[PDB]
Design a protein around this ligand. Structure first.
Ligand SMILES: *[C@@H]1O[C@H](CO)[C@@H](O)[C@H](O)[C@H]1NC(C)=O
Ligand SMILES: *[C@@H]1O[C@H](CO)[C@@H](O)[C@H](O)[C@H]1NC(C)=O
Lengths: 49, 49
């Protein structure tokens, strides 16, 4: 049976806050398709050779 | 058929008379008088713009 991720009880209360004391600069790739190979077919030469 | 004939480096076995493409079209032949193997290339084609 697949796991969805680790459980985490967030330490909530009506008067507690968490604030970051530091940071990391992250660089992450995203890849997107933009074009196909431009194909042409002569239907008469495909069908009738 | 119709095409351009040339010599070929295709290593035919002595029982094979011709070779075929993925399209089922014959693309090489043994000549029946002098037993050389010829490549068949289609006559050049394309769109006119
Ligand atoms: C913040 O993180 C860097 C490493 O990324 C560390 O060298 C630096 O000491 C940290 N600063 C504080 C205020 O903890
Ligand atoms: C006649 O054709 C055969 C192959 O079918 C070949 O072995 C033979 O040498 C040819 N004879 C001449 C005189 O070209």
């Amino acid at each position: 049976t697949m796991s969805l991720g680790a459980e985490n009880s967030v330490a909530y209360s009506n008067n507690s806050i968490a604030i970051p004391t530091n940071f990391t600069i992250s660089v992450t790739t995203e890849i997107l398709p933009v074009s196909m190979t431009k194909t042409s077919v002569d239907c008469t030469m495909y069908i009738c050779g | 058929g119709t095409g351009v004939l040339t010599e070929s480096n295709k290593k035919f076995l002595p029982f094979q008379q011709f070779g075929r493409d993925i399209a089922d079209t014959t693309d090489a032949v043994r000549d029946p008088q002098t037993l050389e193997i010829l490549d068949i290339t289609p006559c050049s084609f394309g769109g006119v713009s």
